[PDB]
Structures are given as C-alpha cells and as structure tokens.
Amino acid sequence: MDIAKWVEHARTCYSTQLDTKIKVIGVIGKDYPDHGKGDNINCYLRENVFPVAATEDETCTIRGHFSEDDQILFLVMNGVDDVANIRKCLKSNPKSNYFDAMAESECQQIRMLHFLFISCHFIIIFEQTSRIDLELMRFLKKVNSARIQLRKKINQRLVASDLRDVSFNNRILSSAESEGRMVVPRLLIAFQRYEKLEKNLDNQFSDILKLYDLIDCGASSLCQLNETIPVVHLLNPNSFVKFLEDNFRSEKNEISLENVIELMNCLQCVLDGDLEEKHEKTAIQTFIKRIQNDHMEEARRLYTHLMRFNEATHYIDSVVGVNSREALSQLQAQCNEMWQ
Amino acid sequence: MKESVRFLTDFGEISDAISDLLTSSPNFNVISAIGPQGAGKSTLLSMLAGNNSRQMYREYVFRPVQTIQIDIYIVNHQIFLDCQPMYDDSTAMSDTLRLTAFLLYVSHTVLVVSETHYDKVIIDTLRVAEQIRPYLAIFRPKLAIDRKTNLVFIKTKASSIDLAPTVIREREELLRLSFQDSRWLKVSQEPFKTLIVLEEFDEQIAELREELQKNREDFTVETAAMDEKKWLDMCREVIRDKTLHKTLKEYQRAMT
C-alpha cells in the first residue's frame, strides 16, 4: 500500500497495538519478468504482499506494509526502472521531451530514497546483474547531497511532530549526526545467482560506498555497515531468512509503532518536496539548457538579412535536438528584432 | 585484413594506417557496437564480420586484449567499428560519451549490446550523446542534417524467459518510447527487430547481417557522393569540430 494512504488509516487498523516496538526496513530492487522487487521479502513473510510488477498507480511510491507477526514495517520503493513508470513518463505528454519526462520520476526516486535513509533501521538492496549497480550509487550520492541540503528544515519538522527526542534504538547520535534523521541505516546487499566469494564483495561493497562518501564520513554519511555481522548475501533461485534475523535480532526493538505512523506522516513533506526551492533542474536538464542557450548565442553570432537568417537556422537545425521546433521559432523573433 | 586493427592512435586521433585500408567506393556500410564489458560485444561483432561458430578463439577477428580505443575491420565494403566497453567518475562517463557520440554520427547502425536491456542508464547515455553534435557546414559534399542513425539493441547471455515474446515486446515498446522524440537516432518499429535476445546459432547472425543493410541512410544529401575513403575525412572533421568540443565541456561541467 502507498505510504501516503497507509498513514491516514494506520492508527485505526492497528488501534490496539500502537505501543508495540517495531523496526522499519527499507527495500531497494527492480522488477523483472516473473520476479518483483519484494518477492524475496514477501517470501520471507510467506505471503505475497507486493506484486510481480508495479502498476501505473503504484509508480514512484514507497509501498508500505506492516507485518504484525514479525513487528516490522517493510518499505519497498517503486522507482524509475519499473516498466509502468518508463511507460507512464514517455506517453504522459507527447508535447514534451525524453529528458524532462524522466527528470520528474528521477527526482521522486531521490525523495523516496531520502525518505528511506532517514527512517529505516536497515535497508536491503537486491541485485541480479552480478555487478553492484553504480548508478544506484550515484542516486545515493545525490540523495545524500539533497539530505545535507535539507536536513535542517527536516529536523525542525521532527521537532514540531514531537519525534526528535523519540529514540529509534540504542545508539546515541550527535546533533550533527542526527540532524534531519532518526537513524543512520545499516545497509545490506543481496545478490542473486564459496565463502571467500561473499567476503570479496564485502570489501568491494565497502570501497565503492566510500568512493561516493556514503560511509565513513561522520555526520556527512548517508548510511553505515555492520562491524562483525555480514552485510552481503547470495541467493539461489533458506540461508537468506537467517541472514536477516542475524541483523534484526542484533537490535532490540525500541520505537513504538504509533510514533512510526507519525514519522511517515511527518516525512511526507520530503515526498512532496515541500522543503525544496522552486525550479530545481537535474544535472542533465542543466546540461541541455546550457548548451541550448549557447546554440542560441552562436546562431545570433551567425546572423551578425536573408542570407544571415538562412545560416543561423541551418546551424540550429544541425545541433539542437530537444525543443527544436520552439528553438527555431524563437529565433525567427530574435532576428526580427535585429532587423530594426 | 586478417584481423582487427586499432582505429585510433594516441589522444583520440585517427590512426594514419587505416586510410590506405579504404576504397573509392560509395557502396560501404558502417556498423558500430557499444555496451558494457562482459557483454561479449567483440565476440558477437566478429561473426557479422564473417566468423563461424566453430572457429578457434585465436581466429576471432575482434579479440579484445591508451585511455580510449576503437577497433576497425572491413570485409568487402563493410566497415565494423568495435568500441571499447562502457564504464573514474566524471572522466569515465565523459570518455564513454565522447566515443558514443562519435559512433552515432559516423555509423549507419550501431549495435547496443548488453545483458540489462531494458537498461535506463544505457538509454540515458544514448540520448545525451546524441546532443553532442558537430557543425560540418563547410564539409563538401554537404551532409545530411535530418539523417537518423539506426540502433539495434542486442541482449546477450540471456535466460529462457528473456526469449518470451511477451517480454521482448514489453521492452521493445520502452525502446521505441525512448527514441520517439529522438532527432538523429532511430529505432525500428517492427516487432522482434529492435531488441534481439541470444542465449549464447549461426543462422541468426546471417539473417541479422542481411538486415543491418536495409535501414541505412546516406550521410550526404545526394546519393553516392561520399566514398569510404572520404568517410574518414568526415571522421577527422568530427573529432576536431569546436562546436562539439564546447558541448562536451559543458557536459563535464554539469556533471561536477
């Protein structure tokens, strides 16, 4: 269920067990034919909770479900890689371009990952490609950059929601470490297909996490890793359920289910972008806009009337790809003004 | 040629040894191949060049053994470009983009070989690299401006479920949406001809080799105005063009 809708009615669905100590666990994965992101998690619950593929109305949402028998609130994110999201972005508006169409979904992935990494005890990444996805790690570094930029405004929202003095677990965090979060999540990774093998990806997983300044950066870290207990697991098409309980039982539950309901309600501002500045473009959007502004300046230089306006058009017809119709017609006006 | 030879020398300059390798014929076809490391792209492109499945490993024409590099090979008048794998930080992405943009401009069709199709990161690279463009207005013969480079996505080392017709069309759709608004890239709109899946079989490469020659669009405004030997002078004028250089600088700037 969508977390925006989960919160509205959670206080009444579990009206009895509001004082039960639970964990919040985030899940990152991709949908594949006959295998959805949460297929390993719904197999851990012996109940297929999440679908084998996200539907159009489930795109770009954190799908929440709370298992009261294990006292865990599982959070799976439907991101930009779902078939239903790539479909819904590239036909939602035929009068748009590819870059802006996926930019909005790429931003919501950033907010949802920002949502998980400030409210989840653990976060499990599922990978099948046999290689650690390095563009997930660029997402996580943009997420950690956005977190640093908005941790002050989110911390005052945890103060207003009475959650800043609510403990998430044993660990005490400095004001620099705790600002904008309730936890520095412990990050885990599960690969889908030999003991020295899993040890070789642990050091691998660690070093790439440091290359993007995601661990071992103090208050600037986005997550952390365990000290003794394994972080990496290998699945086969159950050794896996024991790998989670080793991580889950290493931390006695502490946060009440009620204060988690109000946490997901408090951090809705992160999913809605209520704290961000207006008109924030992606790195690719800024690249497109800056070279298109340069193409307009060089075409005006080519004009500096009939022959001068046939080389400025033929140049923009050669170099400008997106918004080509608007760019050409907007230059017919800039050479009309220069004709005065 | 017995095997593949380096298309570039140092600093991304075109090797002077390949110019004598070309002919004065306008009946040439250039087909590049891009993709990640372990996709088998070099082994696969070797068999559209004419290698049989039973041939030895030392007999493969594209044996993958200097930051950037492209491997050239020509049978008949068929020019095959094998690019170095895609994969640091800014420079790793800036270099990948620099070679992809160059190969989309000088190829009739480019083979996108991967095990991850549909992979949004690959489409992202393809769609921004297409905006890395030169301005070869003074080139003679005048070159086609509305011309689209054909892309053929190939899913290597795939499982049986990747061969399901329902799964191919699902990803083929996402590929035709990813280029519906493309200006200089094109993808076919025939089912089972935009995403080709292989389980890693010679009767598929022979059919594919016959098919890579149909939707090729000429580089020039007038038919048969550029021979393959002058095709390289277009390549030299692409890597030197200042409008292209400035655009790549603004890409790296936006990535930092």
XYZ file of C-alpha atoms in Angstrom:
596
model
C 0.000 0.000 0.000
C 1.073 3.574 -0.736
C 2.531 5.153 2.389
C 0.607 8.395 1.860
C -2.579 6.317 2.135
C -1.142 3.865 4.682
C -0.737 6.623 7.275
C -4.295 8.009 7.009
C -5.880 4.831 8.385
C -2.991 3.075 10.171
C -3.909 4.464 13.602
C -7.288 2.701 13.323
C -6.306 -0.548 11.584
C -3.874 -1.235 14.451
C -5.760 0.781 17.082
C -4.867 -1.923 19.620
C -1.134 -2.408 19.069
C 0.081 1.185 18.958
C 2.632 0.540 21.732
C 4.342 -2.417 20.032
C 8.041 -1.907 19.350
C 8.808 -2.451 15.657
C 11.531 -1.917 13.085
C 11.390 -0.004 9.805
C 13.125 -1.834 6.949
C 13.658 -0.336 3.510
C 13.919 -2.361 0.304
C 15.591 -1.366 -2.977
C 15.242 -3.506 -6.087
C 13.974 -3.711 -9.645
C 11.095 -5.585 -11.249
C 11.879 -8.421 -13.656
C 9.692 -10.884 -15.582
C 8.121 -13.238 -13.011
C 10.055 -11.545 -10.187
C 9.219 -8.260 -8.460
C 11.333 -6.271 -6.022
C 9.596 -7.562 -2.901
C 9.429 -11.203 -3.971
C 12.223 -12.039 -1.531
C 10.512 -10.055 1.237
C 7.031 -11.470 0.630
C 8.646 -14.918 0.620
C 10.169 -14.028 3.992
C 6.613 -13.401 5.241
C 5.191 -16.461 3.408
C 2.571 -14.135 1.891
C 2.844 -12.399 -1.481
C 2.328 -8.805 -0.348
C 3.925 -6.948 -3.235
C 3.083 -7.618 -6.897
C 5.392 -9.080 -9.521
C 5.314 -5.695 -11.270
C 4.266 -2.226 -10.151
C 1.110 -0.878 -11.777
C 0.712 2.626 -13.196
C -0.859 3.983 -9.997
C 1.938 2.423 -7.906
C 4.770 4.116 -9.824
C 7.059 6.455 -7.852
C 5.581 5.497 -4.483
C 7.020 3.882 -1.371
C 4.855 0.792 -0.896
C 4.318 0.164 2.817
C 3.144 -2.980 4.573
C 3.432 -3.818 8.269
C 3.775 -7.453 9.343
C 2.461 -7.569 12.908
C 3.784 -11.100 13.494
C 7.393 -10.014 12.912
C 6.888 -6.426 14.166
C 8.442 -4.952 11.016
C 7.191 -2.212 8.690
C 8.572 -3.098 5.262
C 9.056 -0.300 2.729
C 9.646 -1.128 -0.945
C 10.232 1.751 -3.362
C 8.841 1.663 -6.891
C 11.467 3.667 -8.740
C 12.295 4.850 -12.238
C 13.233 1.410 -13.590
C 9.731 -0.081 -13.393
C 8.135 -0.823 -16.757
C 4.997 1.050 -15.698
C 6.989 4.184 -14.839
C 9.025 4.346 -18.052
C 5.738 3.849 -19.889
C 3.885 6.475 -17.859
C 6.666 9.057 -18.290
C 7.123 8.812 -22.063
C 3.424 8.992 -23.016
C 2.036 11.235 -20.245
C 2.783 14.177 -22.548
C 3.658 13.778 -26.246
C 4.448 17.511 -26.408
C 7.451 17.028 -24.092
C 10.957 15.553 -24.395
C 12.630 12.430 -23.046
C 14.868 14.342 -20.631
C 12.154 16.282 -18.801
C 9.817 13.267 -18.894
C 12.163 11.110 -16.809
C 13.559 14.007 -14.767
C 10.417 14.222 -12.630
C 10.478 10.487 -11.910
C 14.212 10.736 -11.168
C 13.526 13.443 -8.586
C 10.850 11.387 -6.836
C 13.252 8.443 -6.666
C 15.615 10.844 -4.897
C 12.976 11.947 -2.381
C 11.831 8.380 -1.721
C 15.410 7.209 -1.158
C 15.864 10.303 1.012
C 12.708 9.183 2.825
C 14.034 5.671 3.475
C 17.589 6.573 4.522
C 16.324 8.839 7.337
C 13.702 6.500 8.816
C 14.739 2.840 8.262
C 16.649 0.683 10.736
C 18.018 -1.368 7.833
C 17.816 -1.051 4.056
C 18.300 -4.113 1.836
C 19.373 -3.797 -1.805
C 18.544 -6.653 -4.182
C 20.740 -7.098 -7.261
C 20.716 -9.723 -10.013
C 23.153 -8.237 -12.571
C 26.107 -9.848 -10.671
C 27.707 -6.376 -10.504
C 26.994 -3.633 -7.985
C 24.874 -1.042 -9.810
C 26.985 2.133 -9.838
C 24.097 4.376 -10.927
C 22.220 3.397 -7.778
C 25.326 4.702 -6.007
C 25.086 7.998 -7.907
C 21.440 8.200 -6.862
C 22.536 7.611 -3.260
C 25.155 10.376 -3.523
C 22.608 12.802 -4.923
C 20.235 11.656 -2.186
C 22.916 12.285 0.437
C 23.604 15.684 -1.130
C 19.913 16.615 -1.030
C 19.750 15.289 2.535
C 22.632 17.549 3.590
C 20.891 20.481 1.896
C 17.526 19.906 3.624
C 18.451 18.191 6.913
C 17.951 21.464 8.799
C 14.382 22.009 7.594
C 13.500 18.344 8.150
C 14.951 18.380 11.682
C 12.676 21.253 12.703
C 9.770 19.198 11.321
C 10.722 16.303 13.597
C 10.782 18.831 16.425
C 7.279 20.055 15.550
C 5.939 16.486 15.201
C 7.429 15.543 18.603
C 9.850 12.980 17.207
C 13.312 14.452 17.788
C 13.598 13.116 21.358
C 12.000 9.792 20.388
C 14.655 7.082 20.333
C 14.987 4.790 17.322
C 17.424 2.389 19.020
C 20.376 2.098 21.391
C 22.743 4.365 19.522
C 23.238 7.947 20.648
C 23.822 10.353 17.775
C 25.407 13.786 17.849
C 23.334 16.759 16.746
C 25.388 16.797 13.550
C 24.785 13.074 13.026
C 21.091 13.153 13.990
C 20.063 16.334 12.140
C 17.211 15.583 9.754
C 17.194 11.848 10.516
C 16.040 9.385 13.146
C 18.675 6.768 12.287
C 21.772 6.173 10.188
C 20.516 2.986 8.493
C 22.565 -0.184 8.286
C 22.853 -1.071 4.610
C 22.690 -4.628 3.281
C 23.057 -6.119 -0.192
C 21.699 -9.391 -1.585
C 22.889 -10.842 -4.886
C 21.027 -13.465 -6.914
C 22.958 -16.216 -8.665
C 32.356 -20.094 -1.879
C 32.809 -18.298 1.439
C 35.739 -16.248 0.120
C 33.366 -15.073 -2.625
C 30.957 -13.200 -0.340
C 33.964 -11.836 1.555
C 35.344 -10.461 -1.720
C 32.199 -8.426 -2.381
C 32.084 -7.121 1.205
C 35.387 -5.314 0.720
C 34.175 -4.402 -2.764
C 30.822 -3.145 -1.444
C 32.624 -1.166 1.258
C 35.091 0.608 -1.049
C 32.503 1.769 -3.605
C 30.382 3.016 -0.692
C 33.350 5.169 0.366
C 34.014 6.442 -3.174
C 30.615 8.182 -3.111
C 31.091 9.363 0.507
C 28.219 7.205 1.743
C 30.057 5.593 4.685
C 32.922 6.575 6.997
C 32.170 10.294 6.674
C 30.848 11.020 10.165
C 27.776 13.235 10.209
C 28.006 13.519 6.407
C 27.430 9.775 5.953
C 24.175 8.515 4.463
C 24.348 5.015 5.975
C 26.714 2.621 7.724
C 27.693 -1.042 7.705
C 27.896 -3.690 10.383
C 31.043 -4.357 12.384
C 31.108 -8.165 12.679
C 27.848 -9.396 11.163
C 27.655 -9.979 7.382
C 26.256 -7.279 5.121
C 26.358 -9.231 1.819
C 24.273 -12.304 0.964
C 23.997 -14.566 -2.090
C 20.635 -16.030 -3.060
C 19.887 -19.002 -5.317
C 16.778 -19.476 -7.499
C 16.680 -20.829 3.427
C 20.074 -19.217 4.018
C 18.524 -15.800 3.325
C 15.953 -15.609 6.139
C 18.742 -16.389 8.612
C 20.813 -13.538 7.155
C 18.103 -11.000 8.055
C 17.341 -12.324 11.531
C 21.037 -12.149 12.364
C 20.764 -8.440 11.531
C 17.320 -7.916 13.048
C 17.980 -9.762 16.315
C 21.195 -7.756 16.811
C 18.983 -4.778 17.715
C 16.211 -4.919 20.307
C 13.074 -3.134 19.138
C 12.550 0.269 20.701
C 10.464 2.621 18.557
C 6.719 2.300 19.055
C 4.512 1.550 16.066
C 2.498 4.696 16.867
C 5.495 7.022 16.566
C 6.412 5.324 13.296
C 2.945 6.123 11.933
C 3.538 9.774 12.830
C 7.058 9.576 11.393
C 5.767 8.514 7.967
C 3.192 11.302 8.220
C 5.869 13.823 9.205
C 8.234 12.924 6.351
C 5.508 13.332 3.712
C 6.969 16.800 3.129
C 10.078 15.044 1.801
C 7.997 13.054 -0.702
C 6.045 16.175 -1.706
C 9.070 18.470 -1.996
C 7.538 20.983 0.408
C 11.031 21.953 1.626
C 12.845 22.348 -1.699
C 13.458 25.546 -3.633
C 11.385 26.085 -6.757
C 12.728 25.225 -10.227
C 15.498 22.747 -9.429
C 16.703 21.050 -12.607
C 18.547 17.747 -12.887
C 22.201 17.628 -13.921
C 21.125 16.523 -17.402
C 18.446 19.229 -17.582
C 21.023 21.887 -16.709
C 23.352 20.470 -19.357
C 20.613 20.583 -22.006
C 19.532 24.110 -21.063
C 23.084 25.490 -21.023
C 24.185 24.146 -24.422
C 20.846 25.191 -25.929
C 21.462 28.713 -24.630
C 24.922 28.540 -26.216
C 23.456 27.325 -29.514
C 21.134 30.345 -29.484
C 24.059 32.716 -28.899
C 26.173 31.175 -31.666
C 23.256 31.315 -34.113
C 22.811 35.013 -33.325
C 26.538 35.441 -33.967
C 25.999 33.773 -37.348
C 23.378 36.411 -38.169
C 25.866 39.200 -37.409
C 19.213 39.773 -43.643
C 18.015 36.980 -45.925
C 21.350 35.158 -46.161
C 22.139 35.862 -42.499
C 18.943 34.117 -41.357
C 19.479 31.006 -43.504
C 22.786 30.140 -41.823
C 21.501 30.735 -38.290
C 18.567 28.388 -38.935
C 20.635 25.716 -40.694
C 23.054 25.720 -37.757
C 20.334 25.267 -35.130
C 18.702 22.635 -37.335
C 22.039 20.784 -37.147
C 22.901 20.963 -33.438
C 19.710 21.350 -31.379
C 17.833 18.133 -30.636
C 15.227 18.796 -27.947
C 12.681 21.621 -28.216
C 13.852 22.043 -31.806
C 10.529 23.466 -33.008
C 10.436 26.072 -30.233
C 14.121 26.967 -30.627
C 13.804 27.705 -34.349
C 10.607 29.740 -33.992
C 12.011 31.682 -31.027
C 14.974 32.710 -33.214
C 12.729 33.959 -36.014
C 11.715 36.529 -33.387
C 15.287 37.401 -32.356
C 16.266 38.122 -35.962
C 13.004 40.018 -36.459
C 14.014 42.318 -33.597
C 17.515 42.672 -35.063
C 16.011 43.778 -38.393
C 15.046 47.057 -36.683
C 42.671 -7.826 -43.409
C 43.469 -10.864 -41.292
C 42.073 -9.377 -38.063
C 41.022 -6.116 -36.422
C 43.383 -3.148 -36.118
C 43.237 -0.032 -33.953
C 41.082 2.721 -35.462
C 42.639 5.374 -33.200
C 46.149 6.275 -32.096
C 47.020 8.353 -29.031
C 44.822 11.149 -27.651
C 41.865 10.012 -29.741
C 43.448 10.816 -33.090
C 42.591 8.575 -36.026
C 45.438 6.255 -36.982
C 47.102 7.130 -40.280
C 47.357 3.410 -41.130
C 43.643 2.893 -41.865
C 43.362 5.498 -44.656
C 45.123 3.152 -47.089
C 42.688 0.445 -45.918
C 39.712 2.178 -47.580
C 38.421 2.146 -51.166
C 36.982 4.764 -53.564
C 33.512 3.147 -53.436
C 30.256 4.698 -52.166
C 28.774 1.226 -51.508
C 30.008 0.928 -47.930
C 28.179 0.261 -44.669
C 29.470 1.270 -41.221
C 28.172 -0.590 -38.156
C 29.444 0.148 -34.640
C 28.947 -1.764 -31.400
C 28.735 -0.360 -27.863
C 27.967 -1.800 -24.451
C 29.387 -2.865 -21.079
C 32.457 -5.045 -20.600
C 31.249 -8.613 -20.111
C 28.527 -8.485 -22.758
C 30.522 -10.329 -25.418
C 30.165 -7.433 -27.864
C 33.527 -8.093 -29.529
C 32.860 -11.817 -29.979
C 29.409 -11.092 -31.434
C 30.509 -8.393 -33.885
C 33.172 -10.818 -35.126
C 30.524 -13.105 -36.648
C 28.742 -10.388 -38.574
C 32.240 -9.866 -39.993
C 32.300 -13.484 -41.172
C 33.412 -15.780 -38.343
C 31.862 -19.219 -37.930
C 30.721 -20.664 -34.612
C 33.274 -23.499 -34.803
C 36.288 -21.222 -35.381
C 39.052 -21.112 -32.780
C 39.438 -18.255 -30.310
C 42.661 -17.097 -31.982
C 40.705 -16.868 -35.262
C 38.159 -14.375 -33.907
C 38.558 -11.112 -35.802
C 37.781 -8.922 -32.762
C 39.938 -10.383 -29.989
C 39.760 -7.938 -27.031
C 43.143 -7.980 -25.303
C 45.723 4.324 -24.020
C 42.507 5.643 -22.482
C 40.079 5.320 -25.406
C 40.126 2.954 -28.338
C 38.032 1.750 -31.281
C 38.800 -1.340 -33.376
C 38.274 -1.145 -37.155
C 37.719 -4.046 -39.537
C 36.465 -4.241 -43.136
C 35.183 -7.162 -45.212
C 34.008 -6.336 -48.740
C 32.997 -2.692 -48.166
C 31.503 -3.457 -44.745
C 33.108 -1.342 -42.017
C 32.724 -2.669 -38.471
C 33.683 -0.459 -35.525
C 34.190 -2.182 -32.175
C 34.279 0.375 -29.377
C 35.916 -0.081 -26.013
C 33.488 -1.119 -23.248
C 31.467 1.479 -21.356
C 32.193 2.093 -17.674
C 36.867 7.391 -12.577
C 33.661 9.399 -12.017
C 33.462 12.360 -14.464
C 36.193 11.170 -16.846
C 34.820 7.622 -17.081
C 31.435 8.998 -18.150
C 32.871 11.831 -20.265
C 35.030 9.392 -22.246
C 32.195 6.892 -22.763
C 30.022 9.748 -24.004
C 32.751 11.064 -26.306
C 33.075 7.685 -28.063
C 29.319 7.025 -28.214
C 28.544 10.410 -29.788
C 31.312 9.924 -32.356
C 29.992 6.473 -33.283
C 26.361 7.592 -33.617
C 27.449 10.264 -36.100
C 29.670 8.157 -38.382
C 27.668 4.903 -38.399
C 24.634 3.785 -40.356
C 23.625 1.498 -37.474
C 25.103 0.990 -34.003
C 24.657 -2.283 -32.122
C 23.842 -1.709 -28.440
C 24.957 -4.965 -26.785
C 24.140 -5.586 -23.119
C 22.639 -8.080 -20.681
C 20.491 -5.435 -18.970
C 18.006 -4.324 -21.655
C 15.888 -2.561 -20.923
C 18.512 -0.508 -19.051
C 17.644 3.147 -18.487
C 21.301 4.060 -17.903
C 22.124 2.913 -21.440
C 19.271 4.944 -22.941
C 20.360 7.960 -20.887
C 23.865 7.700 -22.348
C 22.481 7.303 -25.878
C 20.079 10.251 -25.628
C 22.580 12.778 -24.239
C 25.385 11.595 -26.542
C 23.100 12.413 -29.477
C 23.161 16.062 -28.329
C 26.973 16.052 -28.677
C 26.994 17.352 -32.229
C 29.450 18.979 -34.639
C 28.664 21.679 -37.223
C 30.084 20.405 -40.512
C 28.507 23.067 -42.700
C 31.637 23.670 -44.796
C 32.138 19.954 -45.427
C 31.758 19.031 -49.088
C 29.794 17.076 -50.208
C 27.148 18.627 -47.949
C 25.997 16.117 -45.348
C 22.502 15.027 -44.394
C 21.097 17.010 -41.473
C 17.807 15.207 -40.751
C 19.556 11.834 -41.004
C 18.903 9.293 -38.245
C 21.330 6.626 -37.051
C 19.715 3.214 -36.636
C 20.090 1.431 -33.300
C 19.757 -2.321 -32.773
C 19.668 -3.431 -29.140
C 21.044 -6.930 -28.526
C 20.555 -8.787 -25.224
C 23.423 -11.232 -24.818
C 23.787 -14.167 -22.435
C 20.074 -14.116 -21.614
C 17.867 -16.726 -19.963
C 14.877 -18.541 -21.446
C 12.411 -16.020 -20.015
C 14.151 -13.189 -21.883
C 13.159 -15.070 -25.064
C 9.444 -14.869 -24.233
C 7.641 -12.909 -26.991
C 5.627 -11.040 -24.351
C 8.843 -9.934 -22.636
C 10.517 -8.753 -25.859
C 7.568 -6.575 -26.917
C 7.336 -5.116 -23.407
C 10.943 -3.919 -23.586
C 10.780 -3.101 -27.307
C 7.964 -0.661 -26.502
C 10.107 1.067 -23.879
C 12.853 1.377 -26.504
C 10.525 2.936 -29.078
C 9.248 5.369 -26.453
C 12.868 6.170 -25.535
C 13.518 7.376 -29.105
C 10.068 8.504 -30.310
C 11.290 12.088 -29.796
C 14.885 11.428 -30.893
C 16.075 13.627 -33.750
C 19.226 11.855 -35.007
C 18.641 8.392 -33.549
C 16.029 5.966 -34.839
C 14.784 2.554 -33.837
C 12.772 0.140 -35.950
C 9.044 -0.285 -35.324
C 8.828 -3.927 -36.414
C 8.296 -6.448 -33.595
C 11.315 -8.633 -32.760
C 13.681 -6.437 -34.805
C 14.677 -3.751 -32.227
C 15.597 -5.979 -29.270
C 17.324 -9.220 -30.251
C 17.973 -11.759 -27.500
C 20.585 -14.522 -27.635
C 21.286 -17.272 -25.104
C 24.976 -17.629 -26.100
C 23.314 -20.292 -33.610
C 24.937 -19.039 -36.806
C 21.600 -18.836 -38.641
C 20.630 -15.727 -36.633
C 23.747 -13.659 -37.317
C 23.443 -14.441 -41.029
C 19.867 -13.144 -41.014
C 20.851 -10.158 -38.865
C 23.788 -9.339 -41.154
C 21.395 -9.264 -44.115
C 19.084 -6.974 -42.122
C 21.614 -4.375 -40.963
C 21.864 -3.093 -44.549
C 18.244 -2.091 -45.174
C 17.519 0.922 -42.934
C 20.880 2.611 -43.566
C 20.574 6.283 -44.500
C 23.261 8.020 -46.530
C 25.426 10.656 -44.865
C 25.159 13.032 -47.844
C 22.271 14.995 -49.331
C 22.943 13.446 -52.757
C 23.176 9.716 -53.394
C 26.639 8.128 -53.638
C 28.530 11.393 -53.139
C 30.914 10.094 -50.437
C 33.249 7.162 -50.882
C 34.502 5.240 -47.861
C 37.884 6.976 -48.159
C 36.164 10.355 -47.752
C 34.026 8.850 -44.978
C 37.189 9.006 -42.868
C 37.699 12.703 -43.626
C 34.251 13.169 -42.097
C 35.526 11.286 -39.039
C 38.571 13.568 -38.807
C 36.377 16.668 -39.094
C 34.095 15.346 -36.344
C 36.796 14.954 -33.675
C 38.245 18.395 -34.480
C 34.989 20.363 -34.608
C 34.914 23.099 -31.975
C 31.125 23.147 -31.541
C 31.369 19.505 -30.453
C 34.266 20.263 -28.090
C 32.373 23.056 -26.324
C 29.320 20.839 -25.797
C 31.421 18.099 -24.184
C 32.993 20.652 -21.831
C 29.534 21.760 -20.701
C 28.602 18.122 -20.100
C 31.590 17.509 -17.808
C 30.905 20.854 -16.113
C 27.295 19.857 -15.417
C 28.459 16.502 -14.021
C 30.712 18.182 -11.431
